[PDB]
């Protein structure tokens, strides 16, 4: 689901993922840290640029 | 007189009488704690 | 183990501001602006919330259940 | 001149680079030559005033002018300790299976403020652990955590898996004694904040207990203190010895609080002036600027006390200040009665 | 049994007295010291705490002439009570008219 959201949009909201997947906060954080970085006032951004 | 204990992983109420080898049904675990007392206890908020 | 109800120095009620604080961390808020939004002006309550470790759920993972 | 120095000594508290000066109250009869500092009730009643500047729920701010440091400190200390309130003292525990220890749980429960009005109760007598309708309150806390019968297959979050896994203070239910149900309308007696996290549970664990609350003063224990923070500060009065203009005026605006010094273009050039000296906190950053050290004179008005009273929600802070003043009056009356009995 | 007088010595001189006040602390001690020091007939007024463990204070009053040093004590208590009443009235008026102008 996280990867599909990243395909759909470059920015992913952590709270939305937590709500949709019903998963705990730390598991969502582990999912995001593998492929995303925190950008303040914008959420989580994909770590690599569009190639 | 029903003496009741709680095993460490089943957490099920087991009634065992005196001089019984400590075990539990639906397990084999052998740490058998005692349930909390029913007597009222008064505590001070200090 | 768990968040203290009162701030140690001043005495402001800080126990009820813990989980909401986590929500602000579940949101995009930084630590400082989340503390500001919670209304902790003096730095003692900010130290209370910022330096607290939530060991209660880790201990509950070892609870009998 | 000498008269100006005497007036500054007896009216102002100056903050130097390394230390404060003129901190002691000195207006006493015989202390000064050209001044009659003997007590005058009429003069004090003329000069004294109270001005409320900000007041919402659980927060009050007001300036008192004409009072001295001793009386202001007495009011602050009475508010901090000598104002009686309602708080939990006794905890009777029936089958506490929670991870939180019984003594820790009781200590946490004691710190929870209670919205009951303390004036309507009396101090419980020495002993008398049973308590009567007049001088106690009872709160029932019974939370049994169990698995949610309907949940998702994964349900990683404890909220979906479990119910009553967080024992909030809203689970506390008031148990009326005697005729307290008639005297107090429903909803008046309750925990103040309604959201304080008391403990955390897992299925199977249960917390069943009763709480006896009795009247008490903050001097006995800090859980009885009504005010979160009751403090006072002397009103600052920043003065400019010489007119500061140019970019150095902007430097002045950056040395102090953002809202105290304002720069204006009277003739197209920026000149600084004191706008709101109240907003200053005296970070004393003007002393870092070598040039600007000798152009300002930071000071506090001796007889101008801004009181900030942030309460815990037991009752509105204005009633708290009234109760503090009445407690000081009661102490004075008690000692006058003792003196009369002696003579 | 709360406030007890103690004269300067066995001679029982009324010029120098010590009032021991029970279950009291720096609040009343300091306020009363301020209110009684303003009396012109008091040479020396001063309170101290015997020990932080026990809740009692010792006020000492030494007058100039032949005052019994109990009259300044009663006068200071009365002045403090009157001041407290006046500040209570003024604060209530300020709160009330602040509320009225708010609405
Ligand atoms: Zn078993
Ligand atoms: Zn604090």
Coordinates of C-alpha atoms and ligand atoms in Angstrom, one line a residue, chain C residues 7-12 42 44-45, ligand 2:
Chain C
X7 CA 4.7 18.5 36.5
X8 CA 7.4 18.1 39.2
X9 CA 8.3 21.7 39.7
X10 CA 5.4 23.9 38.9
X11 CA 2.5 21.4 39.2
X12 CA 0.6 22.0 36.0
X42 CA 7.5 27.4 30.9
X44 CA 9.6 22.6 33.1
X45 CA 6.5 21.1 31.5
Ligands
LIG2 ZN1 5.7 22.6 34.8

